Write a protein that binds this ligand. Structure first.
Ligand SMILES: Nc1nc2c(ncn2[C@@H]2O[C@H](COP(=O)(O)OP(=O)(O)O)[C@@H](O)[C@H]2O)c(=O)[nH]1
Length: 288
């Protein structure tokens, strides 16, 4: 149901061999060629994912995957979307000039996925499920930023990592939450600034923001282009004895989250409710 794909890459390897590797006998096929002129193109920017293929044994594939291919159709595609990066060949593995470590690190630091494939046998097909699974397991994904600092940010999840997470950058994915089967991803503060070393104006991809507050926070700073870049969108500040001047006053930023907060063995309420009814708040909006 609702499945249309696209496959991009250099003329070295574009989308071809997967036609002969389809061997069909969901997730229709191919395309990326013929069609025309921003008709089927930005319609393909309406449906799910796209595949970035590069022949490993030659570098210019990867080089102009970085400088040429990504930025055009990256910001063109919808918020969920994004791309899967795939090295080709790799059955040979000998003449291979690209270690997948640098590739995958560039990818996950572009927040984009990564895989390599032998399309001669096995692993090729073994990619498709690893796509469709996420497509079938998750109906809708949302991307959101967590800004803040110090202790309280250190406190507030899926229990992943620890107050020592993975050094200076990572992303955190959380399973589960009306039979939606959707998904959401939370992101480090400095990581937002880190991937616009790669892609700026990626603030289109974040449908929601989250802020944390401790006994001393001015918080007039992280909100510069937390204001300017996302603009209207959706927003929340969640941070028992709260301090309500700031609640009434310090949101001129408007947004939801009246300064919700919890600390207790009851802290379930906090993360659960906050991440949930906000999602239901986002979904109905839509509007392109
Ligand atoms: N070494 C290697 N080459 C492959 C494999 N699968 C497809 N090809 C090559 O792909 C070429 C044609 O399509 P391709 O270059 O990948 O895409 P195109 O540039 O858009 O035509 C053929 O010359 C094949 O040799 C593979 O598993 N290993």
């Amino acid at each position: 149901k609702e499945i249309r794909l696209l496959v991009v890459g250099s003329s070295g390897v574009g989308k071809t061999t997967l036609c002969d590797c389809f061997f069909e006998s969901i997730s229709i096929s191919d395309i990326a060629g013929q069609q025309s002129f921003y008709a089927c193109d930005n319609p393909y920017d309406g449906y799910d994912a796209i595949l970035v293929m590069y022949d490993i044994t030659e570098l210019k594939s990867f080089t102009d995957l970085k400088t040429m291919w990504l930025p055009d159709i990256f910001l063109y595609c919808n918020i969920d979307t994004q791309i899967i990066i795939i090295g080709n060949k790799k059955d040979q593995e000998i003449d291979r000039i690209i270690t997948r470590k640098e590739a995958e690190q560039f990818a996950q630091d572009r927040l984009c996925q990564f895989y390599e494939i032998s399309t001669k046998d096995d692993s090729c097909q073994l990619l498709f499920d690893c796509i469709s699974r996420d497509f079938l397991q998750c109906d809708i994904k949302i991307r959101m930023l967590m800004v803040g600092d110090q202790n309280v940010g250190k406190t507030t999840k899926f229990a992943l990592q620890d107050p020592t997470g993975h050094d200076f950058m990572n992303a955190i994915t959380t399973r589960f939450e009306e039979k939606i089967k959707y998904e959401i991803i939370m992101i480090d503060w400095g990581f937002y600034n880190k991937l616009l070393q790669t892609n700026p104006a990626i603030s289109r991809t974040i449908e929601a923001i989250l802020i944390v507050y401790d006994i001393t926070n001015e918080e007039s700073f992280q909100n510069i282009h937390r204001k300017y870049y996302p603009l209207i969108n959706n927003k929340f500040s969640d941070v028992v004895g709260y301090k309500t001047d700031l609640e009434a006053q310090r949101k001129i930023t408007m947004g939801d989250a009246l300064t919700l907060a919890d600390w207790l063995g009851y802290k379930y309420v906090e993360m659960s409710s906050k991440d949930t009814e906000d999602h239901s708040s986002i979904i109905k909006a839509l509007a392109h």
